[PDB]
Write an enzyme that holds these catalytic residues in place. Structure first.
Site, mmCIF file in Angstrom:
data_model
loop_
_atom_site.group_PDB
_atom_site.id
_atom_site.type_symbol
_atom_site.label_atom_id
_atom_site.label_comp_id
_atom_site.label_asym_id
_atom_site.label_seq_id
_atom_site.Cartn_x
_atom_site.Cartn_y
_atom_site.Cartn_z
ATOM 1 N N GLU A 170 0.811 -1.217 0.000
ATOM 2 C CA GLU A 170 0.000 0.000 0.000
ATOM 3 C C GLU A 170 0.846 1.269 0.000
ATOM 4 O O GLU A 170 0.377 2.329 -0.420
ATOM 5 C CB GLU A 170 -0.922 0.037 1.224
ATOM 6 C CG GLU A 170 -1.895 -1.130 1.348
ATOM 7 C CD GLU A 170 -2.819 -1.273 0.146
ATOM 8 O OE1 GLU A 170 -3.216 -0.237 -0.428
ATOM 9 O OE2 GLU A 170 -3.159 -2.422 -0.214
ATOM 10 N N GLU A 182 -1.498 9.909 0.669
ATOM 11 C CA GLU A 182 -1.908 9.893 -0.724
ATOM 12 C C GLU A 182 -1.164 10.950 -1.531
ATOM 13 O O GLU A 182 -1.098 12.115 -1.137
ATOM 14 C CB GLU A 182 -3.412 10.133 -0.799
ATOM 15 C CG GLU A 182 -4.049 9.676 -2.085
ATOM 16 C CD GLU A 182 -5.560 9.727 -2.001
ATOM 17 O OE1 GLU A 182 -6.115 9.260 -0.977
ATOM 18 O OE2 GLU A 182 -6.184 10.220 -2.959
#
Ligand SMILES: [Zn+2]
Ligand SMILES: [Zn+2]
Ligand SMILES: [Zn+2]
Ligand SMILES: [Zn+2]
Length: 242
Positions: A67, A89
Site C-alpha cells: 500500500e 496519498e
C-alpha cells in the site's frame, strides 16, 4: 511483546530503503513506533503457533508495504525492499468526506489515505480513532505526523473484521472458518484471501494481477527474513471478490 517475533534488525532488513532520500516518508516509520502500536493490539503476533505468529507479522508488513511501496522492477535489492516509502496519498487527493451522523466530518479536514494501510474516509477515521483513543475525525493528520498513531490505524484494520470479511489477523493465524459461500467462491484460508479482503474488487478473481503479485513478493521476502513457510493459497487469481 511483538519484539519476540521480529527484532529491530529484522524490521529494518525488511523495510530496507524506506529512509532513502527518494522516499516521501523518510524518517517517519520507526521500529519503536511499530512496537508501541502493537502493544495496543496484544493478540497481534501473539496468537497461534510460532509459525502463525511470524506469518501474522510478515503478512501485516507485506500488505501495508504494498500500500505504501516506492519500488520498481530494477530497484536496489528488488522491488520488495521498498515498502513504507509513502505515508500519505500522492497528489491533490480528495476530501473523502461522506454524510455520517455516527462519524461526522470536521470542517476543513480531509480524510485522504494516510499511514501503512492508507486509511481513508471519515467513516474509517472515526472507528479507528475510537479504537485507539484518539480523535482522528478532528485531527486526521495525526495518521501522517505521529508514527505510533500511524501504525495503530493499520493494526486496527488488520485486527478488525468487516463481516462477512473476517479480520486479516484471523485468517493468517488460522482462526477463520469459511462459510459455504466462501467455499463456493474459492476463498480458502491463506495470504490470498487477505488481499481479497483489502482490495479484491479491483485485484482478485480475474487471473494474474501485478498488484497481487507485488503483495506476494513482499510476503515471501519477509517470511524468508523471519524464517517461516508461506502457508498455502497465496494468490486470489481465482477467488471471487467479497
Ligand atoms: Zn532501525
Ligand atoms: Zn537504502
Ligand atoms: Zn469515497
Ligand atoms: Zn477484475
Amino acid at each position: 511483546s511483538v519484539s519476540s517475533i521480529i527484532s529491530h534488525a529484522q524490521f529494518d532488513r525488511m523495510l530496507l530503503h524506506r529512509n532513502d532520500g527518494a522516499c516521501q516518508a523518510k524518517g517517519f516509520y520507526t521500529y519503536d513506533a511499530f512496537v508501541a502500536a502493537a502493544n495496543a493490539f496484544p493478540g497481534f503476533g501473539a496468537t497461534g503457533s510460532t509459525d502463525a505468529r511470524k506469518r501474522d507479522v510478515a503478512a501485516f508488513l507485506a500488505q501495508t508495504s504494498h500500500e505504501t511501496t516506492g519500488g520498481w522492477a530494477t530497484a536496489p535489492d528488488g522491488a520488495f525492499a521498498w515498502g513504507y516509502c509513502f505515508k500519505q496519498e500522492r497528489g491533490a487527493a480528495a476530501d473523502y468526506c461522506t454524510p455520517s451522523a455516527q462519524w461526522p466530518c470536521a470542517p476543513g479536514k480531509r480524510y485522504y489515505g494516510r499511514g501503512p494501510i492508507q486509511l481513508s474516509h471519515n467513516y474509517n477515521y472515526g472507528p479507528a480513532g475510537r479504537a485507539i483513543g484518539v480523535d482522528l475525525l478532528r485531527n486526521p493528520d495525526l495518521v501522517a505526523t505521529d508514527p505510533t498513531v500511524s501504525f495503530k490505524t493499520a493494526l486496527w484494520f488488520w485486527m478488525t473484521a468487516q463481516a462477512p470479511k473476517p479480520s486479516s489477523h484471523a485468517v493468517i493465524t488460522g482462526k477463520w472458518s469459511p462459510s459455504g459461500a466462501d467455499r463456493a467462491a474459492g476463498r480458502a484460508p491463506g495470504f490470498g484471501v487477505i488481499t481479497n479482503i483489502i482490495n479484491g474488487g479491483l485485484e482478485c478473481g480475474h487471473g494474474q494481477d501485478s498488484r497481487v503479485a507485488d503483495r506476494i513478493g513482499f510476503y515471501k521476502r519477509y517470511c524468508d527474513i523471519l524464517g517461516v513457510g508461506y502457508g498455502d493459497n497465496l494468490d486470489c487469481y481465482n477467488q471471487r471478490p467479497f
